[PDB]
Design a protein around this ligand. Sequence first.
Ligand SMILES: *[C@@H]1O[C@H](CO)[C@@H](O)[C@H](O)[C@H]1NC(C)=O
Ligand SMILES: *[C@@H]1O[C@H](CO)[C@@H](O)[C@H](O)[C@H]1NC(C)=O
Ligand SMILES: [Cl-]
Lengths: 21, 21, 21, 179, 169
Amino acid sequence: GPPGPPGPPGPPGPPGPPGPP
Amino acid sequence: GPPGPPGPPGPPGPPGPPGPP
Amino acid sequence: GPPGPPGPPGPPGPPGPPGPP
Amino acid sequence: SQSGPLPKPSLQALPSSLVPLEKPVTLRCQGPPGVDLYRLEKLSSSRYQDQAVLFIPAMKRSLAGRYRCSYQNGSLWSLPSDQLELVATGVFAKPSLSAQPGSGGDVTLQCQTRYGFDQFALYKEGDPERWYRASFPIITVTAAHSGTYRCYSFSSRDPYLWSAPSDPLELVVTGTSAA
Amino acid sequence: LPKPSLQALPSSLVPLEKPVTLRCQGPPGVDLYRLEKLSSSRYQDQAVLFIPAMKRSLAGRYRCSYQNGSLWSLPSDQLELVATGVFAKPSLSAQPGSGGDVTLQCQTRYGFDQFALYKEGDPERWYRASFPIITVTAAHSGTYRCYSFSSRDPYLWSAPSDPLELVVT
Ligand SMILES: *[C@@H]1O[C@H](CO)[C@@H](O)[C@H](O)[C@H]1NC(C)=O
Ligand SMILES: *[C@@H]1O[C@H](CO)[C@@H](O)[C@H](O)[C@H]1NC(C)=O
Ligand SMILES: [Cl-]
């Protein structure tokens, strides 16, 4: 048989950096 | 047949924590 | 064959909001 | 060609985002019709799923916190939803809600506990619920509407783990009937 | 995780339509850089921003940080990116002041309420005032220039004055 189906999308990205004071 | 390709990228991550005073 | 692995993480999120006064 | 980012979906907790321990709650992400794939996630953890709905049959302490979702059109990710704040209630013994009326349009309400909580939340039933917040137990409400008031205590350490709600207190401001 | 540097090259004073490159630099081999402009809340996941032609809307405060593993660095020193030549140059004069001092007058047609004066060299000496009158204690001979601007838009500066070649005794 053929190749496999593409996988699911990856995890959410991490947080952004802490904001300015 | 062989394994399917790795999936698309994840969504952009959430906001960073708030800044200090 | 099997479905693929999950994709890579998403990009990091927006910067944090500005702190209090 | 495309004019901008795909608009954010809504994220909703039904019947409510204040969920007593062991009581059920359904988080539903909702975008425009014909969406390819939803992504529901819990913030400050690696928990997420690739489905619009998360049915929690019995609320736990570990499931309280902040949630959001987005969707995909092809490879493109939408804007994130407004952050849902899922609160576990009934985690501490309920407070006792009293009120001393103060002759100046306002009412001081005591949300008392045999505990050292530094956060208190007071609400009134009725369509737009009127929420009020404080670092101390004695909360002062100005121009207070007649209605059924309850209160919650919690610690800022775990700000999604709330007490059971207080027994209701019926406030009646006189001279404001529909007669 | 220690802070990176953020430089504007050739200068953080950038005339309209002229180039400038913002460069974020931390330790080598890190995962990702984040460069942001504070007022607009627009940012990039790249260490370098090339601005080929300076615009009024690109002036303002920038900062940056880098990510290694999951952790973020402390932010860079704020980079003050100033657009010059937004207004007609002022004209600079100089007179004796009180004691061993020199008083530079930075003359301008508009109502401006901020003035910045500098002496060419290594290192440059900078002086700021709200009145168009900048006193300088024990000034050196050199090539001085002044810029005028408004406090309601503090990153949009005039063209520099013509140089004043000062000699002090
Ligand atoms: C997805 O994008 C296509 C165009 O690329 C558009 O025709 C379609 O209506 C979009 N649908 C949603 C739900 O975003
Ligand atoms: C970045 O993290 C990896 C380990 O995860 C380490 O090998 C590398 O030296 C780190 N670099 C810096 C500059 O911290
Ligand atoms: Cl210069």
